[PDB]
Structures are given as structure tokens and as C-alpha cells.
């Protein structure tokens, strides 16, 4: 195998780096993995299917225009180039290699499509029709949309979109499950906390955050326990950005934000799926957990969990490692069927006041078909009232002592509507045994005399017993 010759490949520092600050993609390419036979779809504002770095890999079967209800996802051209984002993301995954144009995609032999669905009124039906597009042809979906990143919104998929997620992971891809790769958000400057975004907080989305070139948490990053891993993106003006295809058959060197990280992850996942086409949607999350690398990502919250892995609320398990992903995929044994252990915790409502702690010792469905000794995702589904929602901080401690932040204080969130069975999710106790004492902590981080009540706490464990 030889290095790509594309003119901008040297500028794709997150791929071509020789200083170990990269995604280790050349190592996967050298093992023979390029995305051949894999199909990825970008759910965004359209895709310039005639772009000279996309046309060779473009797949109409991975594409649709949900905004105008037609098969052709070509973007709507405007004076400000508003609808360029899907084309940028598509090139990150699957820009053609060795063709003298722009740079290359991570999976430069994968097929690439786009759903034009953000250029219009984005209803629940629009989202669901996009997530559910051709799920026995498209393997991997990439998306970075969700509720407003204003630091005061709590929202997620409505009924049709949630149903699309469960249909995709259950019957998609011949029953192995659609892989929904998701950006964790861009609300960092608003002090947003991404478990408040029900798309990235879902167990069905494989959620990705960003790191800057120098290894730092970018200004736009949101921290939360639902994130699984990290890829490089933009930072300050001394740090390089993402280099990819752009609208009007151009290249760009200034693609930015967490929405540039999710497509790189989708590309790495395409290489991995080429290495083992039989991986399930859960297998893929396991591989990410096992192979991602904290090293040289700076964060003040790196903590070692109960099985000895380092995990951060900014980075998840760390930077994706493509060579490690494709290597581990090849002889990976399919995980056992997913179990779900439901533990309704409260015997009475609990006043929150300044601070509330709820302790509960659980058997994790000992004796039952849903007995779990090997956790995957855990949720604390909470129903509570409070007079100012953003003054709350919420933590959940596993029996192995891993303290997941479920919610950080959000200064702009003035809502008096509380949380209505909101399923705060953590990945940080993956592979732990969830038997034992769990601790929920709710605290008022403000000096104000705030007040409210916790009326339901359901601990929901997913995982296996093998
Ligand atoms: C895929 O995995 C399932 C579950 O382990 C197994 O039954 C099946 O034979 C595998 N298929 C291939 C083609 O490896
Ligand atoms: C609000 C938002 N994303 N919010 C998120 N990912 N939580 C968005 C992304 C692309 C186009 C329009 C809106
Ligand atoms: C997808 C979405 N919102 N989804 C939600 N609120 N459940 C959205 C928000 C702002 C602009 C464009 C899209
Ligand atoms: C699946 C569902 N509702 N199903 C029902 N009411 N039978 C739902 C409602 C709101 C948000 C997300 C999902
Ligand atoms: Ca169209
Ligand atoms: Ca190229
Ligand atoms: Ca957000
Ligand atoms: Cl479920
Ligand atoms: Na997720
Ligand atoms: Na620990």
C-alpha cells in the first residue's frame, strides 16, 4: 500500500500525521481496509453528488431529499453557501483517493450518500423518514443535529424518531442493527450539558466529541456521561481544522465543530465494518470502548472506572484508533443478546431542597432472565420538579465507585418544568458488574433557596451475563 497522493492529503493532519497526534488511519489502510463494500449516509442539508471528489463513490441508494420529497439530495445553492455542511461531512467519510482533487476520506472506497433533511421544517416525521432510509442498504448513518444548543433546552427524539431508532437497531442491516453515529453537540460556550440532548443521550447512537490539534477540549464541546469517544476537530486559530470537500466543487480547510468529528468517526466505523461485516450495533460500541485512547488528551476529569479504563465526560474513552478498531474487529465474538434490568427505586417522593442523596443496593435482576453481571449502558430515569432546573447538578455512582455526572449546572436553564422521566445515560461503567450499591446525588449549586421534589427514580441497566 502507498500513501495517498491527493494534493491536500498532507493538510489532513488528523490522518497523515507522523507525530502520533492522529486517528491511526494509515495503520488500518495498511491492513487492507478502505471501506470497500460499506455504505454511509450523511443526514444533513444535502450532498453535492457531482462533486469531483464525491461522484466516484456517490450512492443514490444511500440518498433522498426528505425536504422536497424526491430522490435527489442536491443542495439548494445560495449566496451565503448555507447548505454546504452535508457535502463537507460526506468528503470526510469517503472523498475519493489518488485523483488529484482535495484530500481523501477515512473510508475512501466506501459508498457515500446524503439525506437532504435539514433545509426545511424539521419535524418528527422528517427525522424519522431520514433515520429510517433504506436500512438494509445503508450500514452507517452520520448526524449532528438535535435540539438547540442554547444551554437551556431539554429535548430529544419524539415518537416517530424514537421508533425509527428502535427499528433501525433491531431490524436494520439484516438484524445486526443500523449504526447511528452522532455528534454530542456544539453548546460549549452556553455551558450546555449534553445528556439534555435526547439524540446523543440515546443508547442507540454512538456519540462522539471533539479534541483540538494540541489535545485540548474545544470551546464548543459539551461534556456529558453519554458520550463514548472522540475524534479531532477544530480549536483556536493556531490549530488546524478539518480539510474536506466543499460546495460548488471546491475544497475547504476550515470545517469545524463537533459536527466535523462525527463523520470522521463514521469513516473509522466503516473501515471496521469492512473488517467484520457481522458486527452488531452493540459490538461496534464495545470495540470503541475497548480500543479508544486517552493518551495526550488533556482534561481535568480523567477517572479510572471499575474495570481499569480511563474515562472523561469531555472525551468518553478517548480518541478513536482506526488500526486498533479494525484489528480487534477481525476475530471479535458477537456479544450475547442484550438484557435489560429495571429497578424502580423510590418508596416515596423525596424532597430535594439543597441536596438529596438516594442510596439503593440492587441485585441487578439476580435469578431472572435479565440478570446482568456485565453492564453496557446505564440510565437513571428521573422525574422531579424544581423551581430553576439549571441550578441542579446530578451524579450517579456505581457499586464499583465510578461517579458519572448525569447533569451539570446550566446557568441559562431557567425552566421550572423539571424532568419528566428523563433517561440520563452513562457509558462510564461499561463492563462493570452493576450489582451492589448505587448512589444518586442531586444538588442545588446556587446559593438561592431552591426547592422541588424527586417523585421517580428508575435505574435501568443494559448488558449481558457473559
Ligand atoms: C454472525 O454472527 C452470528 C451470531 O454469532 C452467527 O450465528 C453467524 O453465523 C455469523 N455470520 C457470519 C457470516 O459470520
Ligand atoms: C440545533 C442543532 N443541533 N443540535 C444538536 N446537535 N444538539 C442543529 C444542527 C444542525 C442544523 C440545525 C440545528
Ligand atoms: C432536530 C431538531 N430538533 N429536534 C428536537 N427539538 N427534538 C432541530 C432543532 C433546531 C433546528 C433544526 C433541527
Ligand atoms: C414511543 C413513544 N410513545 N409511544 C406511545 N405513546 N405509545 C414516544 C413518545 C414520546 C417521545 C418518544 C417516544
Ligand atoms: Ca431534491
Ligand atoms: Ca481526492
Ligand atoms: Ca447540546
Ligand atoms: Cl429498551
Ligand atoms: Na449516544
Ligand atoms: Na475508580
Amino acid at each position: 500500500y502507498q500513501e495517498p497522493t491527493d494534493p491536500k492529503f498532507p493538510q489532513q493532519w488528523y490522518l497523515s500525521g507522523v507525530t502520533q497526534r492522529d486517528l491511526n488511519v494509515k495503520a488500518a489502510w495498511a491492513q487492507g481496509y478502505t471501506g470497500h463494500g460499506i455504505v454511509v449516509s450523511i443526514l444533513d442539508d444535502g450532498i453535492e453528488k457531482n462533486h469531483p471528489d464525491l461522484a466516484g463513490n456517490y450512492d443514490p441508494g444511500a440518498s433522498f431529499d426528505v425536504n422536497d420529497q424526491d430522490p435527489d439530495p442536491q443542495p439548494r445553492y445560495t449566496q451565503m453557501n448555507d447548505n454546504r455542511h452535508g457535502t463537507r461531512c460526506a468528503g470526510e467519510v469517503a472523498a475519493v483517493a489518488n485523483n488529484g482533487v482535495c484530500g481523501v476520506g477515512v473510508a475512501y472506497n466506501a459508498r457515500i450518500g446524503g439525506v437532504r433533511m435539514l433545509d426545511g421544517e424539521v419535524t418528527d416525521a422528517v427525522e424519522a423518514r431520514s433515520l429510517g432510509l433504506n436500512p438494509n442498504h445503508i450500514h452507517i448513518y452520520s448526524a449532528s443535529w438535535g435540539p438547540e444548543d442554547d444551554g437551556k433546552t431539554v429535548d430529544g427524539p419524539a415518537r416517530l424518531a424514537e421508533e425509527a431508532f428502535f427499528r433501525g437497531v433491531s431490524q436494520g442491516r439484516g438484524g445486526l442493527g443500523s449504526i447511528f453515529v452522532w455528534a454530542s453537540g456544539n453548546g460549549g460556550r452556553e455551558h450546555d450539558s449534553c445528556n439534555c440532548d435526547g439524540y446523543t443521550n440515546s443508547i442507540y447512537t454512538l456519540s462522539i466529541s471533539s479534541a483540538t490539534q494540541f489535545g485540548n477540549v474545544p470551546w464548543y464541546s459539551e461534556a456529558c456521561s453519554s458520550t463514548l469517544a472522540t475524534t479531532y476537530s477544530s480549536g483556536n486559530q493556531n490549530e488546524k481544522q478539518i480539510v474536506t470537500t466543499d460546495l460548488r466543487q471546491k475544497c475547504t480547510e476550515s470545517h469545524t465543530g463537533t459536527s466535523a468529528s462525527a463523520p470522521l468517526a463514521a469513516g473509522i466505523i466503516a473501515l471496521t465494518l469492512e473488517a467484520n461485516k457481522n458486527l452488531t450495533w452493540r459490538d461496534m460500541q464495545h470495540l470503541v470502548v475497548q480500543t479508544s485512547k486517552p493518551a495526550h488528551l488533556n482534561a481535568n476529569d480523567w477517572a479510572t472506572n471499575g474495570v481499569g479504563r480511563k474515562v472523561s465526560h469531555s472525551y468518553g474513552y478517548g480518541l478513536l484508533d482506526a488500526g486498533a478498531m479494525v484489528a480487534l474487529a477481525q476475530n471479535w465474538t458477537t456479544v450475547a443478546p442484550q438484557r435489560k434490568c429495571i429497578i424502580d427505586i423510590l418508596t416515596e417522593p423525596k424532597d430535594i431542597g439543597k441536596r438529596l442523596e438516594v442510596r439503593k443496593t440492587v441485585t441487578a435482576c439476580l435469578g431472572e432472565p435479565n440478570h446482568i453481571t456485565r453492564l453496557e449502558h446505564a440510565q437513571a430515569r428521573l422525574t422531579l420538579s424544581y423551581n430553576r432546573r439549571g441550578d441542579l447538578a446530578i451524579h450517579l455512582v456505581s457499586p464499583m465507585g465510578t461517579r458519572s455526572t448525569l447533569l451539570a449546572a446550566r446557568p441559562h436553564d431557567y425552566s421550572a418544568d423539571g424532568f419528566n422521566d428523563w433517561a440520563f445515560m452513562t457509558t462510564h461503567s461499561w463492563d462493570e458488574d452493576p450489582s451492589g450499591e448505587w448512589v444518586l446525588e442531586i444538588e442545588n449549586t446556587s446559593e438561592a433557596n431552591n426547592y422541588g421534589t424527586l417523585t421517580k427514580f428508575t435505574l435501568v441497566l443494559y448488558g449481558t451475563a457473559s
Side-chain angles (χ1 to χ4, degrees):
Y1 133 100
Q2 288 308 279
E3 194 113 313
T5 60
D6 302 68
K8 302 209 133 325
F9 179 67
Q11 283 68 43
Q12 296 185 300
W13 54 275
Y14 42 91
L15 316 175
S16 70
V18 306
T19 67
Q20 252 173 49
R21 303 330 201 276
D22 60 50
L23 296 164
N24 200 31
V25 163
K26 285 184 288 185
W29 293 341
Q31 292 178 64
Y33 297 111
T34 57
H36 183 76
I38 309 303
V39 176
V40 184
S41 186
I42 302 303
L43 311 183
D44 204 283
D45 58 13
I47 181 175
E48 189 172 80
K49 66 191 176 296
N50 57 321
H51 196 290
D53 230 20
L54 302 177
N57 288 336
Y58 178 71
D59 182 4
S63 305
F64 202 80
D65 181 348
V66 176
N67 294 130
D68 280 346
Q69 308 209 284
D70 70 65
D72 182 359
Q74 193 80 13
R76 181 177 57 97
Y77 293 87
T78 59
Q79 282 185 307
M80 250 182 306
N81 297 315
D82 302 81
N83 296 294
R84 65 185 186 186
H85 193 257
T87 293
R88 290 176 171 209
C89 296
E92 293 185 79
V93 181
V96 169
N98 300 311
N99 70 338
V101 177
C102 297
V104 309
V106 171
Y108 55 71
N109 284 325
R111 272 184 293 168
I112 188 68
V115 178
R116 181 171 177 254
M117 45 83 60
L118 293 178
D119 192 15
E121 197 195 357
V122 183
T123 61
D124 180 41
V126 162
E127 300 178 5
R129 286 173 42 76
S130 304
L131 296 168
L133 177 70
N134 207 6
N136 291 312
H137 180 69
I138 296 163
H139 300 110
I140 298 154
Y141 302 78
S142 188
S144 50
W145 40 268
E148 292 292 332
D149 283 336
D150 55 9
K152 53 183 180 58
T153 298
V154 183
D155 199 13
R159 178 166 180 176
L160 295 163
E162 195 66 63
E163 290 167 331
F165 282 133
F166 216 153
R167 299 172 69 79
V169 301
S170 300
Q171 289 89 32
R173 207 158 56 85
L176 303 173
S178 302
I179 296 164
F180 297 110
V181 181
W182 218 275
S184 59
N186 284 312
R189 137 164 103 99
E190 308 302 339
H191 306 287
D192 201 359
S193 190
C194 34
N195 291 344
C196 291
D197 163 353
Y199 301 82
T200 195
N201 187 56
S202 175
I203 72 175
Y204 307 125
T205 60
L206 195 164
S207 296
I208 301 291
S209 294
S210 299
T212 72
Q213 182 179 23
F214 301 163
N216 291 314
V217 177
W219 64 270
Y220 50 81
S221 175
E222 300 179 41
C224 58
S225 56
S226 55
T227 295
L228 259 191
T230 298
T231 66
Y232 284 116
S233 190
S234 62
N236 64 37
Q237 299 194 39
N238 305 94
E239 294 172 302
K240 289 175 156 47
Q241 305 186 331
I242 299 311
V243 176
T244 186
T245 46
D246 204 5
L247 199 64
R248 303 185 193 268
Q249 308 186 25
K250 295 171 184 159
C251 321
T252 184
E253 296 176 2
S254 50
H255 184 37
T256 62
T258 318
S259 59
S261 286
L264 295 175
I268 294 176
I269 288 161
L271 303 178
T272 308
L273 209 54
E274 190 189 4
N276 181 348
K277 292 260 285 171
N278 212 36
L279 296 165
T280 70
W281 71 279
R282 278 166 59 238
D283 288 329
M284 193 65 64
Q285 298 194 20
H286 282 269
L287 293 177
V288 170
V289 169
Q290 292 204 7
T291 62
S292 296
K293 300 298 195 298
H296 309 130
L297 295 177
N298 303 313
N300 70 1
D301 75 335
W302 280 115
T304 301
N305 68 11
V307 297
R309 296 191 180 109
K310 277 171 188 165
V311 68
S312 158
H313 296 75
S314 293
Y315 300 128
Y317 286 90
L319 201 78
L320 294 183
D321 179 340
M325 286 279 286
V326 300
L328 185 57
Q330 287 178 56
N331 284 321
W332 182 264
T333 298
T334 314
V335 291
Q338 186 215 54
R339 301 177 183 205
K340 178 187 188 178
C341 179
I342 298 163
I343 307 145
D344 210 12
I345 303 272
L346 304 185
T347 58
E348 51 161 28
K350 297 287 191 292
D351 179 67
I352 293 170
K354 176 70 177 167
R355 185 186 142 95
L356 170 67
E357 185 182 275
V358 182
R359 307 185 85 89
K360 182 76 180 146
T361 299
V362 312
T363 63
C365 290
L366 181 64
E368 312 173 6
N370 281 295
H371 182 217
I372 292 162
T373 66
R374 194 185 170 205
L375 193 65
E376 290 172 357
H377 322 83
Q379 298 160 328
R381 307 199 177 179
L382 306 185
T383 307
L384 65 88
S385 52
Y386 211 67
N387 65 301
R388 189 182 174 97
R389 190 165 58 192
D391 285 349
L392 291 176
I394 308 179
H395 295 81
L396 180 70
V397 192
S398 73
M400 297 294 295
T402 304
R403 188 162 192 259
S404 289
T405 305
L406 298 184
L407 181 67
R410 290 202 306 165
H412 305 324
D413 186 1
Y414 57 82
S415 177
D417 294 338
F419 291 101
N420 183 17
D421 195 39
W422 189 259
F424 295 97
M425 191 271 280
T426 181
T427 64
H428 290 205
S429 285
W430 200 281
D431 285 325
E432 297 180 3
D433 188 332
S435 181
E437 186 176 59
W438 289 79
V439 182
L440 182 74
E441 302 167 348
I442 302 172
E443 52 197 319
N444 174 17
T445 65
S446 170
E447 295 302 325
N449 294 313
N450 296 329
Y451 54 93
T453 309
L454 179 70
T455 57
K456 192 188 281 159
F457 169 18
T458 314
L459 182 68
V460 180
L461 311 172
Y462 294 97
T464 64
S466 71

